[PDB]
Structure formats: structure tokens, C-alpha cells
Amino acid sequence: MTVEPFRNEPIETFQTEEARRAMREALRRVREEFGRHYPLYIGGEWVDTKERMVSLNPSAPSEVVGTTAKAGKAEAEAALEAAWKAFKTWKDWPQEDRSRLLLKAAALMRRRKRELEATLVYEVGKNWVEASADVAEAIDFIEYYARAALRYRYPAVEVVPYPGEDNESFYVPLGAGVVIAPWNFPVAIFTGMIVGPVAVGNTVIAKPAEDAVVVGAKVFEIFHEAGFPPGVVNFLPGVGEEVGAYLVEHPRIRFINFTGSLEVGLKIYEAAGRLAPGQTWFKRAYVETGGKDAIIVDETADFDLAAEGVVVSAYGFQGQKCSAASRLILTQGAYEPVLERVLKRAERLSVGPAEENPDLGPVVSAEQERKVLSYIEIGKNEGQLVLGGKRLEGEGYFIAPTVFTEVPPKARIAQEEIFGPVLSVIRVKDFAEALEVANDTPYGLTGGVYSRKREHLEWARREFHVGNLYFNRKITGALVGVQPFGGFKLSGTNAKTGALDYLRLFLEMKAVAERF
Amino acid sequence: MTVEPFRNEPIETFQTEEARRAMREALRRVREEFGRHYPLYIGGEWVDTKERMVSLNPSAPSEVVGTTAKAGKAEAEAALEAAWKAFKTWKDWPQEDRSRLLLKAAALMRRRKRELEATLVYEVGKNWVEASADVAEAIDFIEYYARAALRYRYPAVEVVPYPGEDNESFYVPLGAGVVIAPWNFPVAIFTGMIVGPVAVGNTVIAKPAEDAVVVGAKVFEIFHEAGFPPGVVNFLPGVGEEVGAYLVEHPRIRFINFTGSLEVGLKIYEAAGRLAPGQTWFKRAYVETGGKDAIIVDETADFDLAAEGVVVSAYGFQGQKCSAASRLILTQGAYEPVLERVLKRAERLSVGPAEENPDLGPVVSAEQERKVLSYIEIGKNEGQLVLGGKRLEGEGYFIAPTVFTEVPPKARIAQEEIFGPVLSVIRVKDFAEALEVANDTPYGLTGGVYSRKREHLEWARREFHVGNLYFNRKITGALVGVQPFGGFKLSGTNAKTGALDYLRLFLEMKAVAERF
Amino acid sequence: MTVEPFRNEPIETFQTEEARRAMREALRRVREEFGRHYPLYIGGEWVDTKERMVSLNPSAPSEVVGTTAKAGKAEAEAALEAAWKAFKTWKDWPQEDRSRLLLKAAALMRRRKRELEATLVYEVGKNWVEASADVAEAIDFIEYYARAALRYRYPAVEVVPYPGEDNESFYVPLGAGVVIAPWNFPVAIFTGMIVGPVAVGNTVIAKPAEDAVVVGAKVFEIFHEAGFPPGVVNFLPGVGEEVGAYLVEHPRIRFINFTGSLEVGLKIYEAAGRLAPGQTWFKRAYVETGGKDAIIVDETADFDLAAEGVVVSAYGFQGQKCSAASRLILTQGAYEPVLERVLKRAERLSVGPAEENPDLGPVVSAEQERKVLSYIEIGKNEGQLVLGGKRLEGEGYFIAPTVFTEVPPKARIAQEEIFGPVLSVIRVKDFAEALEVANDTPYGLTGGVYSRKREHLEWARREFHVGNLYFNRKITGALVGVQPFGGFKLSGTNAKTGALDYLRLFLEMKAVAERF
Ligand SMILES: NC(=O)c1ccc[n+]([C@@H]2O[C@H](COP(=O)([O-])OP(=O)(O)OC[C@H]3O[C@@H](n4cnc5c(N)ncnc54)[C@H](O)[C@@H]3O)[C@@H](O)[C@H]2O)c1
Ligand SMILES: NC(=O)c1ccc[n+]([C@@H]2O[C@H](COP(=O)([O-])OP(=O)(O)OC[C@H]3O[C@@H](n4cnc5c(N)ncnc54)[C@H](O)[C@@H]3O)[C@@H](O)[C@H]2O)c1
Ligand SMILES: NC(=O)c1ccc[n+]([C@@H]2O[C@H](COP(=O)([O-])OP(=O)(O)OC[C@H]3O[C@@H](n4cnc5c(N)ncnc54)[C@H](O)[C@@H]3O)[C@@H](O)[C@H]2O)c1
Ligand code: PRO
Ligand code: PRO
Ligand code: PRO
Ligand code: NA
Ligand code: NA
Ligand code: NA
């Protein structure tokens, strides 16, 4: 198979009339379908259930954006039988044929990208550019994994020769496993976690987050139209601690690919370590969890650049990103100038229904709102509230861009993942202390430094212990292929998505010798 | 760093009078040194204790080969401080500097190889060639990992460039981890599991098997002479279920590299999945556990070639190998002619003290002996005893080569790892049925087919589900670099030793972007 | 598939007492087996006929080395059905599977090499070293083509990518073809012409030379033991102008791979260009035909080195090589000193039955003998006879080493391939005239220059118009891999044996585009 060198899908800015018109048309088409019901997808067919999942517009939660079927234990069992039955022949597909299937799904997705972005707007309250970058990342994952998979094709392993013998080592896929996905990148991450394992010959049961069941269904419409054989990808919307826990714990689940909270990640990794009755393997579990990400700014930085970058990182998608800057660590000389600039910028951010393309839309659910508001109550005790900190008017879950200052490094709001538009500002003496404070959390996902001092940047390269570090730019929006993505410590297992290494996680190796 | 391309260390066969002379002298000197005491090795110094580990000669268990110090909790804590402290600066060595240190350790081990072989003969009851293969394999691990580590050096990761930015991804070592090793390859596997992680910048606390603590101290004598900095490598002989479990479960242990019984490996892997109080990472655990390894023979095979490889595979080191043929699966037309040839060869095998270079020495301990004899009694009620089945006269732990035939595929002796000189012969109709029976165990480590039929060989290549498969040759003795070693299913986590992939298991990845 | 890098099979010289012992035993056993009957081999089974081919010992033609079955039209038809049917599934084998089958065939031939050399000594009158070179060359073809075939595997072709599309180009084998081989290298060339096409997925009907049918059956014994599927390779000893022509002209024959006389090669190539009734393709035909090969010597040469290489080149296997020096072109200052040295060396050559390991055995048949003696009589009227020119006493076909001097460049004996121990010496003024005379024949196979002058060597490199040119060494004995073998002009189609290019001749290319 020969295709163009990988390039990232362009993220639509909507600066042109044509792009704005195209988005308006998609928003309209999407909302005209708010009444749709999407069944489960099992063994190549849409299969409905008696019970259902309801999906709301977090910008107007009296508005239903759609409903899906609801998978319980029996549907989980049916998905298993279908996935294992498919694995038997899907594993034997030439790699070029599997890679071509992915390339088809990418092209189908690329043709439906405005519709997908409009679904993200309405279903999870992403503004226009956030939605665009989510869909573009999903496309990138498919394009990138299609190509990367060929690097593993029969027989890919470099071995030492031996006289009188052929020694052949090669990779094979593991089997059927479960993908359990978050609501916050419910096209991109949902899509990458599924197609990476599938590309190399594994089969997948995908469990979308409750808050994003509708857009996950539309991803499966693309999978179905691309023509994945029956049982290869299966769609099981349902309750995480029910159907998800059942599959994680199952003796016939071979691997688990998880992105989500640390709380859940810890349970999953623990259950994966256990031999379920009748299980005949050591389960592989990949769990990519949260962060408490910091940006450091020292007195040498471009303060305007820093402030813009901080505001993008802290408040993009209302701070509901594992990559979000939730801590701003400022050296003595950077403290006032950067903080004043951050407050000026952030106080100008608009908040409202996502479809109007505000700076911030709503947080995703009533539960998210309750959790973010509780952390704001905690923070009022721990630091100084200087901006926002309030629910805004309307039914939608609108929360103001929030800033706490004089936050002690060990405060709960300086330690725990709030996952909303809440920035904790920490004042430190110098760069060494800034690094100490950055490293001193259980987490290690993203981090940023604004500085013109080469020695500070190169020092951070070696000692700011996060899996994704950025200098003099935002810390969010890791691009497939460019910035392998994944963290250290309690940010997860360092499965680097959008990287050649990712596929190896879903392969095992056989070594066959023939003595002639 | 530029060295000669890797070549495997030649395995001495003691055919030349020169080799015999060298080996006699080495055995004499080791025997003359019986009763010697070896302390722990922690933070670069030999540290003694009040309690001791006693190492007996399984050929004459009245004889004390030597004793070691004994690590409990306090020594585990001292070793942990020493390893983490060492790690801080060891991780920053250039890869070339670390690789040269491995190369120096290999040159030193090679200079001491007759003495280390002699030590294995006396301590674990290896005959001369089995001892020579073990030491040569340990040399090979060091030479191989020294070179393979350079493939991962700063910055090794292939990324997509982005306008206006440098994007640099690179590998870093994990931290301090524990290595827990078996008695059956106490030089090769003990060395490989240590120097792999250490090559790429990790530090290691090493826990040798109770039955092989003396040869483990001698490997540490080599490390100490080579000049590994204080803390990089630590030697903690002790009780597996005491000090070993303590480290496996410790919040400050970063990874666990384990080779041994499935029973223990299940416990380690389960414990590794738990977050111990105060732990700040997801533990990595590699467990390579046993097998129930079969050789298939069909009627097209060279029956003399088969009989010979079966005997070598079944009985080499007394069947005490994770790779040993413990099942012989014979199609109907192969049954009589192969079984006859196997019985004729096996009844001529000599059994006696290892220093005499017999075909078989003793099993390793009174507990191994008890267990093997017990399985023999079980086997007597499951299949037909046609050879051996007896303890031999003498104080050493000598068990005659044993064959059961007409064994049911689901018999305990056809399913459970006996780890002794006990072969179970299974009669099947055809190659298709041969393959079903071969695959139908909890394990997936090694396998073999003797056949001249290309379609049967190529069928097995695709469907004989073992990590290490061999055609028309023995199924033991996988060579570093040539045959990446590791299994499927409950034979472990498929960490492939002596392959480039192995070292990636002890690294994590950082992605650092600078926007200019 | 990973094997050791290619190395040429060492050519036995029988200097060691061990080699002499092995060769004496092998000759004794072949001699003891005289009169054995070998059937055809078709669709994987040995198939006898009523008629037979008789194979005589040219050293004692009263002795029947053996007999074979004889293929006419019906057997050609059965072989065609078998080859096309085999082709349907053989073309779909992974390249690695087909290459391993070649490797197994090479290991088997190597194990039988003394017996095959012994068979050549008796059947075609090779002395021991000539027989050893022939078998070693056949081993080399298999080893070489097994590896070279992997360079062409799915999808091998380098193409330009295109937006929105996968473009995949790859090679497929042609079909079933006929191989028609000479008697003079009945192991090497017979094997190479067969296993080349077969390696990459073609099937072959093989027609050995009448004088070498016994050693051809023995090569087929090797194929059959190796396990080539029924139909992939078929053995049809028979009359070239009967069954050979029948296949060349058949509408269902896809390609023809031919080595032999120019006269036959002209007919084959002419017939291949015709569309037989109902034929659905343009036939491919490779014809490698004879030479009139010269060595040039100038006055700068080492005259002893030259005399020695000339004698080896002219007289090795009785001058019965397409590569043999049949012309010695001497500049004026080289004329006397080289001719004297050549005459002195050649008059010491021993001639006798091949089993005695003489310098020269007999020519291959009564017809070869008639033809060579007839050319000798022609030569007597064209140049000056200065050595030999006689039949020797005895029943075997023994002809003395023969030299003619002052031969006109346009003499029949200086133009036409005699294929016997007959050297024509031509006297020229200078290196320029040496080159004109060298180029002025219908042929362009092998050539040689002895000279120390760099400008003459480098001039010849550019302008001595032969496919295989050699400086300061013999011009026979081209090694697989080292010296791609094949000529220019009426020495054939320049299908270069033992080179990567050879296999491309038996493949065609498909280009498949998917627009996503
Ligand atoms: N490391 C990363 O790449 C990264 C990226 C995106 C999001 N995240 C993290 O995801 C979280 C936000 O996503 P979320 O709120 O959907 O997280 P979540 O943990 O609550 O849920 C994630 C998924 O797991 C399911 N789940 C919940 N309980 C389960 C159980 N006990 N067993 C099996 N499945 C269960 C949910 O139904 C959902 O599908 C944040 O913590 C964020 O940091 C991390
Ligand atoms: N897969 C492989 O590469 C491979 C190779 C060699 C041996 N083995 C396996 O090794 C086994 C024989 O070796 P063994 O008898 O030493 O195995 P074992 O499991 O009894 O012990 C292995 C090591 O673990 C330690 N140990 C025992 N209990 C422990 C605990 N609960 N926690 C931590 N450590 C503990 C022991 O002290 C020893 O050092 C066989 O099953 C064999 O197949 C596997
Ligand atoms: N260029 C080379 O690589 C090379 C190598 C070795 C031999 N040769 C040539 O081989 C010749 C000697 O070999 P030979 O005497 O076996 O040659 P030949 O032409 O008489 O026969 C070669 C093969 O063709 C068959 N044959 C004869 N007539 C045929 C017909 N019309 N149609 C189909 N097949 C026919 C024969 O049975 C034999 O199998 C010499 O000229 C020599 O130079 C060339
Ligand atoms: O970096 C980001 O913001 C997104 C989410 C994880 C992968 N890429
Ligand atoms: O294959 C074998 O027999 C040994 C065991 C570990 C790897 N080498
Ligand atoms: O060069 C030679 O003498 C032989 C003839 C074919 C190729 N090898
Ligand atoms: Na929703
Ligand atoms: Na011992
Ligand atoms: Na003959």
C-alpha cells in the first residue's frame, strides 16, 4: 500500500463565509435530528434494547439531543461472542487490507466532519474550533494508525541469524478487548482507542461515555459504512460501573483500553491484575488518567505571549481537558505582570450556548457543575478568589472563568483535578522552586514553560517530569504524530497515542525456528 | 560506541582435552571453596547479616556449597534508599557510558566462565554442557543488551515535524525496581533480568532464588569489579514470600521483573495492579511463568531425528526448564515408531552426581524431588507408566527418566507443569487433532513439530499458539538475539528476552515541543 | 524469514584424506547402482512408461549408468494439467513459505553432494573437481534464489503516491512453463533454471538433456523429499526435438527457460514469438546459447599466470563449457612466450576415465566425439596443428588436448563453437587489434584479458563486448551472486543467472488503485 506521507488534518478556524455557512447548515441538520434513537451495534448490525440512554444539550438541558439503546450484561455477552468470532478471521487479514479499511473510514469521517463537529457542539458543549480540533484529531488517529500498522507487518522483527536455520519473528494481535472512553474528546479519543487495536488485527467492544452516546453512535455509522466485518467493532452505550465493569472483569476480555478519571483508572488497573475464574491470560490494561497540569512563567518570558497561552490552556473547552493548565506557577519577577495580564484577558472571555461559538460553553452535565462548584467552595477557603467563581444565568451549565491566587502548593485546589474553568496561581521564589512545585503532585501529564532563558528551558526538558511538555506555547491540543501523547505517575500507563509505539501495546510476538 | 556485530557466545561441549582440563581445574577449585560465605551487596558494599541462607549440593545434600547473608525488611529498605539515590545520577549517564559498563561486565564474566559453570554444576546440579549453555546465555544477554540499548538513545523517537516548532520525543528510564529470579537458570536469567533494565538507566534490587544464592553472589562479584556505581545493582538473597513479596508490594518499587512459577507470577501481577498506600504510579510487572510444552510428530517425520530432539528437550537439565518438552503428541502413523525410538534412547540415559557430567544430574532440592515423585504417583493413575518412575539410590535427588503413554489430554500430568524428568505421550489421529491437543492447555511457551510436510509446518507456524516454536529440532535452548524468548497465555506477559523489544518495557516516553 | 547472509558453497578439491575417502565411497556406491531405472515425476508421483531413455558412461559406453521413463505428448499433457492446477494455489503461498521450501531443498542437496558429484563423474564424464563445482553451483542457485525472491515480495514496487488514494503495485508469477536444460551442467543449470521461476510462484515442467537424465532424476528425488506440492515441479526426460518442441510450441505453455546450443535456441525463440492456436498471451523465452570465448594476452602480462588460466579455461571439462576459452588471441610480443608455456602445460594433461580424476575425462557421447573430430579435420586445413588433434585409444570418448596456431580470425574453427578440447591461437599486432578480433564473432558470452597495463584492462572493461569478462584469471566457473552470468549477441537473451534481475524475468506486475 502506497499513500501520501501523513499530514495532520487542518483545524477549521471558520474565518471564511463558506466555513461559517457550512457550519450553520450542519448545526441545522444536527438539531433537526435531535429526535433520533441509535441502537447498539453488534456483529455488523444495529440492535436495539428495551431500556435507553438519554443525551442532553448541556447548553439547554431541557433539550434532548438523542437517545441510544443501553447495553447490560446480555448485550455485553453478545458483543463478546461476536468479537471473538470476528477475531478468528480478522487477525488473518493482510495488514494492507486492514490499513485500507481504516483509510476508507478516515475519508468517510472527513466527509462528515461538519455534522460531527455540530454534534459535539450540541451534545458536549464544545465551541466551534474545539469541535473542529476534536474531529480533526479523530481523523488524524485513523490516518496515522493506518500507516503505523504497516511498520509491524509480517515478519517485522529484527533477529540474529543462525547457521542451518531460518529464524522468523513476527507480531500477532491479542484478541477481543474493551475500549472505555471519556465524554471530553468523544470523537478523537473514542476513535483512536478503537482503531489503533483494530488496525493490527484485534477486535473491539467500545463503551462510550454516558454524556456522549449520540456522537459515538455516529462514529459507528462511519465504521458501518466503511465495511468493517461483523464483530470487529461493536458499540455498547451503557453505564460505566455496570457494563464497563462487567467487561473489565470478564475472564474472556483480553485487553482494556481506558481513558478517563484516575478514580476509575485505579479500579480498572486493579481488576486487570486479577485472574478471573476460567481466565487463560494476563490481561493488558492501558489506563490514561487525569492531570494537574502547570504552566511556569519566569521573569524572562514574553508576558503577553504567556498570558494568551495560559488563558487558552486553562479555559479552552471550559478547562475540561486532561491537558488543561489548572496551575499557574509564577516566579517573584513574573508574578504581577503575568497575573495582571491573565486577569485582563480572562475577564473578557464570553460564556454561553456553545452553538454561538463563545470562548466558553457550558460544563458538560449537572454532575460536572456540582463538582466544579464544590471545588470553588473549597478554594475560597484555600486561596484568594480574584475572578469568576459563580454559576452564570440560564438553564445551561455555565460557569465563569475562575482564578484563585495565593494558593498553597499543597492545597486541594493545587493538587486535585477539578476539570472545570478554575486556575490556581502559585507564587514562587525562583525557577528551581517553580520546578519543585510543578513536580509535586501525584500526576505527570502536561506542563508548560514560558521563558527566554535557554538554561531554564533545557533544565525543564530534563526535570519537569510530565509526558508532554511545551515551551512558549499552549499545553493543550497535542497533535497526532507530532507530540506522542501520555503521562507519567498517576496520569496513567504512558501509552503514547499518535505514535508508532502505541500499536505495539496491542501485539504479541512469536518466534519460529526451522532447522533445515 | 563501535563494537563488533553481536555473535552468540560459543557453548562449550568439552570435546577437546584442553576444555576437559580447564573444566576439571575449575570444578576442583569450586569444590575446594565449599562452605564460603557471601554477604548482601547494597549501595556498592558487601553487607553481612546475623541470619543466613544455606546452599546445598543437590548431588550430595550433606555438602554445603556455601552460605549467604539474608535480607529481611530493613535490608530491603536500605537497598531501596541506595537504588533511588543511585537512580538520580545513573539515569543521566550517556547511553554509551552505560553500554561500555555492560561490555566490561561481559568481558569479566567470560574470563570467569569455567568457574561460574563449575558453580552451577555443584549448586543446582547441571551437567557440564547445561552449565556451559547457562553461563554463555548470561554473557549473551549482557553483550546483546549493551548494543540494543544504543537503539533507544536520545532522542530516539520518530515524530511528525510541525511548522515553527521543534518536537523532540525521547525515552527515559522508570526508576528503581525489583528483579526476582528462578533457580533453574541462576546465571542467565538472573543476569538478563538485571542488566536489561540497568542498561537503559534503571537501578535494580535483585532477589536470587533460595537454591541458587551462591552463583548469584558470584555474578555480583563481577558487577562490583566492573564498577557499577553504588546503588545501581543490589543483591538481596532471602525468602521469596518474605523479602520478595515485601518489595513487590512496596509503594516505592517502580517495576517488577519476574521469572518463575505461574502460582507466584499470578500473585505478583495481582499485587502490582494495586496502589499501595502512598504509591504515585502504576506499577509495571513482567512475569514470565511456566509452560506445558509439546512436541508434535507426524508420520512424515524423520523418526530418528525426532526421537533424539525429544529426549534432549524432555530430559536436558532433568526436565527442569520452562521450555522442556513435557508432552509428546504423536499422530497414529508416528505413534509406534517414535515411541520405540524415544524409549530406546531414554533408557540409555545416565543419572548421577552432576560433577561426573552424566546425562542427568539430580533435581534441585528435597521439595522438587517430593513434588516430582508425587506427580509420578498421580500419573500412574492417569496414563501408562512405560519407563522409570522411580527415585534412584543415593543421597542426591536422583530421579530416573520417566515416560507415561496413552495419557488423556486432560490428565493432570498432561496439563500441570511437573518440572522434572517426566514425559507424557499422547496418541492422536492426525495433525489437526495434534494441534488441538497442543493448544489446549493454560500455557503457550514452547512447542515443536517434527514433520517433512510443508503444509503441516506452515500450518503450525500460523496456529501452534506458543511464543517460541521450533521445527525439526529441539525446543529448548533459545539463543539470545536469534530466538526472542517469551510465551503466550499463562506462560506470562510475553516480555521477549534477547530482543530489541525487551528494553522498551523499562522505558517511558517524554514529548517536548518548543515553539520558536 | 531470517537466514545467514549468502555465501557460496565451497568447491571440494579432494586434498584432504577425509575428502578422498568420502568421494571413493560415493563413487563406489553410484557404480554399484548402475542400471537403476528412474521414472517420470508428474503431479507429485513417479510415473513410469513403456519406452525408455538409456544413459551411458562416456568413459566406458558399454556401461549403462541408468535408464529413465520417456515422456511423449500424453505425458507432456499430464504434466501441463498438473502444473497449471498446482499453479492456482502455489502462486498464493507467502514468499517466505516458498523460500523456506528452497532452503530445505538446498540442505537436502548438500547432504547428498558426494553422491551427486559421483553421479556426474559417471554420467557426463566430469573429473572430481568439475563435478564438485557443478553440484556446489546448484546449491548456490537454490540458496541465492531463496533469498533473492524475498526482495520481490508483496507489495515490492516503488510508486508515487496520489492524494486521496492508495496505489499499490506488486508482482505475480506468470504460470506454468517449460525448462529445457543441457547435459554439460546437468545439476547446476538444470536446478537453477527450475528453482528460479518456482521460488517466486511459477510451476515448471523440466526436460533434462538426453545424456544427463539420471542425475536429473536424482535432483527430482531431492525436490520430492523437500515436499514441493504435487504439480509445482515435473520431470520429463525425453527427446528434445519431440517432447521439448511440443511444449515450446504449446498454446498453454506460459514461458520457456532454455540453455543450450545456438541452433536450438534460435528455433525456440522463433517459435515463442508465434501465437499457437488458442494461445492467450505473448510467450516469454529466455535462451542462453553458446560462445566463442577468447582470452587476450599482451606483452605486459605475467606469462606463467596466463598460460595456466588459459589451460584451465580451454580444457576444464574437456572444453565442453559455454564459458570455455576456445580462442587465444596473442599480441606480437606475447605470441612466442605464451604459446610455448601453453603448449608445455597442455602436453602434460592426463586423459582417462573420469573416475580416475584425470585432467580431462571423455567427451560426453559418440555424437560429440564425431563432431569434435570433424572440426579437428576442418581446423587442419585452416590453421597449424601444434598439439594433439587425435582420438585416444579406448572405448570411452577420449580426445587429446588440441591446439591450432596461426588461425585466421575468420576461420571456421575461430568462429564456430566446437565444444571440445580444441584451442585456436590467433596472432595479432597489438591490444587494439586483439580487441577487434575478440569482438568479431556472432557471440558475446565470456572473455578474458591477461595484462598488467591498467589502460588496456580498463579499455577492455568498456569495449570487450562479452557479458562476463575476467582479468588475470580464468574465464570459466562464474560464481552465483558474485558474477551475474549471461551474454550478449547470439550468446543469448542476457538473462543473468545468479543475480537479483533473474527472478524478475518470471514475474509480471499489477497496479491497483483505490480511491477512498
Ligand atoms: N490521560 C488522558 O489522555 C486523558 C484524556 C481525556 C480525559 N482524561 C480524563 O478523563 C476524565 C474525564 O472523563 P470522564 O468523566 O468520562 O471519566 P470517568 O472515569 O468518570 O469515565 C470514563 C469512562 O469510563 C466509564 N466508567 C465509569 N466508571 C467505570 C467503572 N467503574 N468501570 C468501568 N468503566 C467505568 C464511564 O462510563 C466512561 O465511559 C478526567 O479525569 C480526565 O482527566 C484523561
Ligand atoms: N517463562 C520463563 O522464561 C521461565 C524460565 C525459567 C523458569 N520459569 C519458571 O520457573 C519455575 C521454577 O522456578 P522457581 O521454582 O524458582 O519458581 P518460584 O515461583 O518458586 O520462585 C521464583 C522466585 O520467586 C521467589 N518467590 C517465591 N514466592 C514469592 C512471592 N510470593 N513473592 C515474591 N517472590 C516469590 C522465589 O524466592 C524465587 O526467587 C517453573 O515454573 C518455570 O517454568 C519460567
Ligand atoms: N549460455 C549458457 O549459460 C550455456 C551454458 C551451458 C551450455 N550452453 C550451451 O549448450 C550447448 C551444449 O548443450 P546441449 O548439447 O545439451 O545443447 P542442445 O541444444 O543440443 O540441447 C539442449 C536441450 O535442448 C533439447 N533440445 C534439442 N532440440 C530441441 C528442440 N528443437 N526443441 C526443444 N528442445 C530441444 C535437448 O534435448 C536438451 O535438453 C553448447 O552450445 C553450450 O554453449 C550454454
Ligand atoms: O492534548 C490534548 O488536549 C488532546 C487530548 C488528549 C490528546 N490530545
Ligand atoms: O530456551 C531455554 O531453554 C532457556 C530458558 C530461558 C531462555 N533460554
Ligand atoms: O561459468 C561457468 O563456467 C558455468 C557455466 C554456467 C555458469 N557457470
Ligand atoms: Na449528553
Ligand atoms: Na543449592
Ligand atoms: Na550419459
UniProtKB/TrEMBL annotation, chains A, B, C:
It catalyses: L-glutamate 5-semialdehyde + NAD(+) + H2O = L-glutamate + NADH + 2 H(+). The active site is at 288. GO terms for cellular component: cytoplasmic side of plasma membrane. Pfam families: Aldedh. Pathway: Amino-acid degradation; L-proline degradation into L-glutamate; L-glutamate from L-proline: step 2/2. CDD domains: ALDH_PutA-P5CDH-RocA. GO terms for biological process: L-proline catabolic process to L-glutamate. Its EC number is 1.2.1.88. NADP(+) binds at residues 181, 183, 207, 210, 240, 261, 289, 417. Residues 46-512 form the Aldehyde dehydrogenase domain. L-glutamate binds at residues 184, 322-323, 477-478. Belongs to the aldehyde dehydrogenase family. RocA subfamily. This is L-glutamate gamma-semialdehyde dehydrogenase. It comes from Thermus thermophilus (strain ATCC 27634 / DSM 579 / HB8).
